[PDB]
Amino acid sequence: TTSFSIPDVGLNGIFATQGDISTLSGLCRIALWYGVNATRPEAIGVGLPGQTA
Amino acid sequence: MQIKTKGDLVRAALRKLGVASDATLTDVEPQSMQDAVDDLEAMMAEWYQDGKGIITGYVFSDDENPPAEGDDHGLRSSAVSAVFHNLACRIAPDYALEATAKIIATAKYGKELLYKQTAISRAKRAPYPSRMPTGSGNSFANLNEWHYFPGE
């Protein structure tokens, strides 16, 4: 297992690798855990042009 | 092809032997034909040793469908001659007969040709032993820590 940083966004996840049995192959997983939250829904907004009829 | 049934194979074998054909005035008994079909089935099962012998595509009849004769043998176009030549050679002793030299040679040639393709397919080389290194010229394997062959 290794640390694995996503560029641009400021997040760090894991990069894990395991090997199969009796064969030259393996599995690789790039996992990363996050949850997006809106603490002030009244502060966010939306713009909707052309909302006629 | 005009030989599409086990009974057709038996009739061809008998014609090759000279015992019965479509031109003779005396024909063999249906009991004799059934015995020849039993021989053909037994010989084919002996050849096809539960899938680990001479693969030919022959289809083994079941007892639910009553008559073995009348079933398609399923052989490819290039197996019929070998099959019925060997069958004639095998059923020759039934009639105090002896298959001729041409029939025997053709049976041998046909059996060899039948097994040729299966032998070519089966001539497969075993994998590397479990103790052989993969060498450092295999860059990705060396980096990813597959330093020895798996084997098996």
Added chain:
Amino acid sequence: MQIKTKGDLVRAALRKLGVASDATLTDVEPQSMQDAVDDLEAMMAEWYQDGKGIITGYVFSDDENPPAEGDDHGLRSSAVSAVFHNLACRIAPDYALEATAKIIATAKYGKELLYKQTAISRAKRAPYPSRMPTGSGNSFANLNEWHYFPGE
């Protein structure tokens, strides 16, 4: 060629065997003709192992065509002798005869000549192994980074 059909091939084989020819006083028997045609079809199928055997140009009849006899065999001019000599040798035991030494020798010679060109064509050399360098003499490949043969 004046031998243009399976019937001509069968008639030539029977004449060579002495079964039915104008040299004797016998005509070709209609029931013998069908069996000889079946034997010829089986022998062509056994030879031509679905493309991996002896290539001759023979055209295999289908179920739709009513008479097996009458179709052009499609053989080249250089295979007729081999085909009908082998046919005579194969269908001799039907009449409890034995093909003579000249007929057998001609059949062997014809089959060898039939496979000569195909053997020459298949005498091909395997490509270079993928672990062989191209050598620094091959300036084009070495500049283009082809330091080893592609193989396969």
Added chain:
Amino acid sequence: ENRLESILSRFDADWTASDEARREAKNDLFFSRVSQWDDWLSQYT
């Protein structure tokens, strides 16, 4: 006239003129420092 065009033209001329020697030198460095099996264009099974 353009400074960028003149500089790029000169650089392109030199880079293309000195290519073969550079490729041979890079191959020598790779062979002597990484691995003697410079076999990446040959597609084995």
